[PDB]
Symmetry: C2
Subunit: 48 residues, 2 copies
């Protein structure tokens, strides 16, 4: 399967807090946004 | 500047389920990705 790059407009406050958590959990800020989106659809689709 | 456009590499499977969920609730797929990320930091920051 291929990958689709989507542009997400984030405010500077949320974007900075996402980058801080990745350094403290040795993750990458790009990986956590994917996991944030992935868990969002999984939770909300099982409620439909 | 408090507006930063970030590119998130999403696979076609997650990219389609986010847009489908967005069509069924009339909020844009872009709005849910910002809310998906926002809830991730808020939940994970209270775990630190």
């Amino acid at each position: 399967s291929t990958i689709k790059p989507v542009s997400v407009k984030l405010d500077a406050d949320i974007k900075a807090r996402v980058e801080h958590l990745a350094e403290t959990r040795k993750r990458s800020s790009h990986w956590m946004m994917r996991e944030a989106i992935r868990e969002y659809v999984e939770r909300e689709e099982k409620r439909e």
